[PDB]
């Protein structure tokens, strides 16, 4: 058995157990991925690698993560591009920005990407996003084109409480987003 756990209920200016990439940085209380500026990318990773599955036994880890995020758009109607929770190789680095969310490079399936992400997409990219044009939660596997989505109404500047759990027994990944109001 190998377990890795952590809890950060409030970020600090000197958050040393985190790796920052792009414009990501911490402040007292919050972790900022991007400011309200055009064409940027910000990422933050937990410092320690995590043993997710083992080739020897073929076992896969059960895991659960919870976080609270806030999207603050200065133009409440024109919002882009979104936020994601991802699981990538240990040497992961920012990928294509904009609609690619800094985690992918195309809408086709790329096994070399080796990334699973759960997106909170705020902008409709015609090339791959749902036709209903709704903002949405999506499960991404090696591609920006989600394998499954759920329309979601963004509450500008409101704290979203999220829980993502993975059941090793059933290979079911569950995402859950809740708002106060």
């Amino acid at each position: 058995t190998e377990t890795t756990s952590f809890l950060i209920t409030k970020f600090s200016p000197d958050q040393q157990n985190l790796i920052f990439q792009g414009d990501g940085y911490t402040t007292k209380e919050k972790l900022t991925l991007t400011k309200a500026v055009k064409n940027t990318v910000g990422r933050a990773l937990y410092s320690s690698p995590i043993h997710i599955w083992d080739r020897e036994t073929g076992n896969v880890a059960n895991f659960v993560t919870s976080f609270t995020f806030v999207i603050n758009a200065p133009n409440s109607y024109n919002v882009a591009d979104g936020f994601t929770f991802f699981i990538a190789p240990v040497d992961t680095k920012p990928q294509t920005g904009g609609g690619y969310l800094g985690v992918f490079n195309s809408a086709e399936y790329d096994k070399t990407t080796q990334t699973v992400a759960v997106e909170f997409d705020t902008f409709y990219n015609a090339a791959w996003d749902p036709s209903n044009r709704d903002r949405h939660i999506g499960i991404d596997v090696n591609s920006i084109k989600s394998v499954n989505t759920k329309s979601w109404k963004l509450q500008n500047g409101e704290e979203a409480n999220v829980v993502i759990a993975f059941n090793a027994a059933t290979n079911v990944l569950t995402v859950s987003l809740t708002y106060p109001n």
């Binding site: 058995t1 890795t4 990318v41 997710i52 609270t68 096994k111 995402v175």
Partner: protein, 47 residues
Amino acid sequence: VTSYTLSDVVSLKDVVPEWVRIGFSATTGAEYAAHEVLSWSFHSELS
């Protein structure tokens, strides 16, 4: 209290390496917004 849930099967073993790093990503393009995280917890167990 508004809530949304989504779920699907993901064969992690065939997509990601044995060891991984986890994190958050957020981007802007021609349009934009501030993306922030207020707290974070994680727990994994591999038998």
